[PDB]
Symmetry: D3
Subunit: 317 residues, 6 copies
């Protein structure tokens, strides 16, 4: 259902990239940097004796109150930190499974995406469809009002907040996540170049046009099809639509990443077509590597979790 | 998958009704009535020689700009009017198929629901999930900020606007729609008692708890399941959740309807369980009737469209 | 699952055309023209004040009694007429939705196909399979006894009957229909060259061999696969079978069409493959046009209905 | 999806039986007995040294030419005979697998059903639907014109023809078949009481109303649902329809069977619900027995074939 | 698809329990206790600085070499230990996600089931089917040769080995697992009463007969259906089959558990019917609790992971 | 989903062939030939008067007790014999349907494959997975311990046993089977060159790598995918795995076949891809022929059974 591996290795993407892409994002970062986070920490009901578990809240662009789990090991001195991002429609998950990295002495943070399955706020205020999908949310509004634009900014802002924590060495921060979380990991490391390590598992939010070309604009990408069916049935605004989506196409932000990257891709993945994953991978200029799993689809790949941790452990000296 | 027809005719609903239901709605109607609609009519690109086609815009509660197709026949004197409501995620549709009632001398209006498939605006500004579903949109916010509360008010406000049109006899306005449109038809006739005729085809938005009890909280009702899975996995707040959804349960509004009602239900419809449809039907106190289609599911039922027009044509003496 | 749009534009078909195709149809036309229609009109139970609704019955070839809905506006003088054809296994449908064109002053006729979901008779009398499918009905009999041959003749015969109606301007007649109805519309305009306008939506009954070549001989075209599995499992008579089906392949009749044609096609339509639709379209020699819907399948395409009406309204001076 | 075995044992049926059922069938038998079979035997291209293989053709009611495979062992004297009936839409099948009974010295005959997958003719000539299904074929016509009525007569007529074969002992004839073939076997033994043995495997064509009551009027019984959806959507003629189908309900003919009967039923069979099978079984008044297969559906049941042969071998002294 | 919660609470099971159940297991334990484990530890390629990761191998009954991951924290003194068991056809998984409990100072062990997805050996040597399923593996052989009998013994033996580790406090050992792993957790805590804590998530291997009664002997329990279809199609040995399966029905071993138990059940779980889960739960006599997730099926339930860890942390003083 | 018939006829396979293929098999044949079969014949409970039905047991390699149905006609002198092999997970089936060849004077033998649906024993004793699949059974053990290696030897040993039966003409033995039975037929005729006739219907166990390349390593070939997913997720040992599977790839054994071969293939068969079937066919050097069924999948093909018997009947002069 996608090109052979031989060609994936060379594929660099299909979705257009706005001509003012750089200006667009420099502007976005300016807005993010002018925000007063007014950070608040609340002790979680979940408690362990070897670490402090806090519910962290900060204000992002447009006044949205963002939430993230925050686990701090009870150890002296500064150390590495890991920021996890979750899948589409999910949330930061349970506290306990974040402790595997705390065991390694890491501070661990897991952010909730605005308006999805967690406790992060989506202030809305956009024109157009609001029933299904965040990718097309704000698509018929001004480009600067696209929801994933704010979400991407939240990850960048959170990375800076984490880097300012007293127990965190700002030069030893890594980000990780699967699918949407993998796309957000790339976006975060792109918008906050200080991020040192990046683990992106079968990333979502990449090379939109390609997904549509493969007749795969379904499942997680169904909203792109819904959009055209309802607002441009004969595709009279196709190029403008995909160009605008180019603003939130991680394959376009990929060139900004400075940290080391480790990715994985399942060749049976029809949710996030292998070609869209390689497009993001092939736009990365920093040190990188990608693990290929021929028989896996959009799912955790056996053994990769271990490769990812060993990769993250590289944050220590 | 549901109770026998024998029991259906006796079923009055399961979903709870808030203690302050009436005051909640009188309070909502007060808000709607205090809004300056600033009505604007723009000529449509679709034009015929026997009628006037206009895109109508008005401001609803919370400042949302609402859109509706508006077709006026080129005849003299006042006459009946029909207000159509559409299915979940859809829109007012095409202009041409609305002309069947125009041929009958009716003014035809088809409203687009906020943030769905048309041109009506959803101003948002709610806390909680915004990724999928309007039923749960605002569920974790104040009850007065629930999206379908505003949408229901839009239907009532539009009915009032239509009743003030120069060519419309305010005492001869009918409403109609399938699924979501069927629930909206009931809500509209309930909130604007002046509505004279009502056609509700396999109505959606009714008896939420019942849908869940039958393990049918999927398909169109999937979001109710996602809500619990993400925000209350062990149903510790079950009664509170369904009670709040009770505010937008059209079965609870039904008692207010004064116009004549004609409904249809498919006994194979698992999207809108027959019991939930009968629950709404059985709460109506005005003159009513329901057509039963044993072998039909969530779909147009052969012959009903004709029964619906003959029913609407009763508006003429 | 089909060639790219770029290639579809140049695709002219795969299914063969019998060497005696022309003589076959001229002989077929002679047979129908010799039939005494014995037309009878019966007032319908469905009635409105602005039009006359009649159930029309006429005798077609082989003594079959054919039925069609007939709506005549209560206006003065001659005017255009629209003849609608329905989907496979369906019928003429409801009376009310045909009134959109009556609003435009058109006489509207909707024919029921022999032995399908309506009230038209299939006298049968053929050898071979009679359990499933009209495409293969009479395939093992003489070619002059193939059921769709008679059905095509019914459309041409009905077109002439309509052109002889007192209120109908014989030079202002249009035909329209989706899927099977789209194929019948083409066949009608081909067998009755006086037809002025043609709207063919995702036409069925075209380029049979191509459907099979694409492994799409299922769904609506399943009977073709059943025929071979049961009567020619090793395809020893493949060319003979498809050539014979060529007699009722609308892409072969398309060359005879003189009226203007407006078609629509969904690129995700696997029921009527895009290539088979373009094959019919590319064989049309009269003024034509085709609307392409990239994200639509075998279903009504948003906005096309309005395009079709504006197209039909061109029949008025 | 059906009642427990405990209840199945006592279930006698739901579908009605016409008050003139008996006269209907006696009149039907008189018609077939007046037909001149004009039997013709043609040597088959398939030949073996130990038997004679012929394609047998005889004329049935309404002038239909019926076909059946006919294998005669090259032995001396009279012996038993087995008549096989096939599944819905299938045919008599291959010659070789019929030889298992020829090995036992049986003459084997396998009839093709009119207009299905074989070489038997369906003269048609009925009013109503002819697109899908033989159960509803002729349902809107006179009851004496229902297709399965003629097919049942074909089995009885064939049974008599076989009983008149020189090498066949008329008192040692057995009939067998699965699904449709199981229903035909029952009908045959009912209309031709001389039939000595009967093997009916998960019989189709039984207790129609029950199939519909269970919401299983799909798959093989789909046409019943199609009939109502198209010709009686609100079931205003429900009792009339099912009572008429009672003429061809094998559970109503079962009382006439005189030969011993061996049946089998799969409790997971949703195509032919267990209750409809037991309904036919429980109406049999002759020596009978039924093998129950808890984990089998609409399919051959392991070991039953051997039970069936040992049962048929009882025809030998 | 299963009884209401009200009745689940009281349901105690349906599958029989052999009369010599106790003798059978006392005998099995004797065989296990006579085995020389000949334990061998091999450093894993996966290494972290805060713990020792070893591949542990021991010999179980019948000479099978069993494998389990073994992670020991680099801390002084004795402490609690957790033994994880995996799902059907899976294995011990990755090393990294086991570190969440190591962070809590626990020694963590994850055993691979014989012949499944890991490195544990199944010496086989049984008669009967060996193609699919371990539940019926050895079912046609002597009861003492049933594979899950050995597997259960492996868990008990491993628990004793863990309790003998120098860094492990033998009175602070817990076991946990989902589905098959949940069934194995119950079996382990039953056969090694010293186990102090038990977390069983939607347990598999319980109340076999019940699964079959609900027509749910499919998916994970498909082999039970396969067995009957192939070896006892008419269920002539039904009681003997299910009674024999009673030897490895965890609901029967449940009464032996002494440690505290925490379980979870998804009411939408058709893989492990809620009733079979409550049957095991209701046979437990030690301190216990069960978390119900109405909208979850056979899958991890949000929040439970955290309840499970807090429950396990109860092992410390 | 596969290459065009034009290319199929030229395709010779993709799966590698071990360098020591021949010695591996000569070594295997040596082992089989050194086994004392200790043949035992037990009269079956199924008995007919024209043939002798016996359950035959013999010891194969590794001490496994193998079972086969054995039917001998009550005729004088030596005659042909037919050995049938069954489908994956199935068994020899019923006795009665084997009598068609008995009627032709043949002795008919139907072998049960070790550990599948019949009475043949799989002694096991292998390391690695034992939960699902015989193709990978023993794959992680020495190549000489692979299960299908022993099964292949069982077919060869049984052929030799049959050729020594007093009523059997050793030069007139044919083998036949579908799917797995088709692969076993080829393996048998390859390992026991004396086999005179071969019928292989849509053979399984051929060209493994090709199945994987087409993403068809599912359904019957699912275990190959499970193997990689669990034991080599990144395919680091891909060539080694497929090369080893090459030992039991019937396409590699095909070159040894001396008897005449007749095969059939369905072009819609995704279970046993057409290419893999043609790969085996194209490696045969003896007289051969293949029947192509374009519209058939993994299923019996109409008419082939008769071609198969006529082909086998060629054994008589
Ligand atoms: Ca480092
Ligand atoms: Ca004009
Ligand atoms: Ca006897
Ligand atoms: Ca404690």
């Amino acid at each position: 259902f996608d090109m052979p591996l031989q060609k994936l290795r060379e594929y660099t993407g299909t979705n257009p990239c706005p001509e003012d892409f750089d200006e667009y994002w420099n502007r976005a970062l300016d807005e993010m940097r002018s925000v007063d986070p007014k950070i608040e920490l609340k002790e979680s009901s979940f408690q362990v004796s070897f670490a402090e578990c806090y519910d962290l809240y900060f204000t992002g662009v447009r006044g949205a109150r963002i939430h993230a789990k925050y686990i701090k090991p009870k150890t002296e001195g500064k150390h590495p930190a890991l920021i996890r991002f979750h899948g589409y429609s999910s949330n930061s998950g349970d506290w306990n499974d974040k402790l595997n990295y705390v065991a390694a002495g890491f501070t661990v943070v897991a952010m909730d995406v605005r308006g999805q399955g967690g406790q992060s706020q989506d202030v809305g205020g956009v024109t157009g469809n609001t029933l299904n999908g965040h990718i097309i949310r704000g698509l018929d509004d001004d480009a600067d009002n696209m929801l994933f634009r704010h979400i991407f900014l939240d990850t960048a802002q959170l990375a800076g907040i984490v880097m300012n924590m007293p127990e965190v060495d700002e030069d030893r921060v890594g980000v990780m996540g699967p699918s949407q979380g993998g796309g957000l990991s790339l976006a975060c490391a792109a918008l906050e170049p200080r991020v040192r390590k990046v683990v992106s598992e079968y990333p979502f939010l990449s090379d939109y046009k390609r997904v549509w070309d493969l007749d795969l604009a379904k499942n997680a990408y169904q909203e792109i099809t819904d959009y055209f069916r309802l607002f441009d049935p004969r595709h009279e605004r196709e190029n403008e639509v995909f160009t605008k989506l180019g603003y939130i196409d991680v394959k376009n932000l990929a060139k900004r990443i400075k940290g080391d990257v480790l990715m994985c891709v399942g060749l049976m993945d029809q949710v996030c077509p292998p070609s869209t994953v390689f497009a993001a991978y092939n736009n990365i200029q920093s040190k990188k590597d990608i693990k290929v799993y021929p028989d896996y689809g959009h799912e955790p790949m056996r053994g990769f979790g271990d490769l990812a941790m060993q990769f993250m452990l590289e944050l220590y000296s």
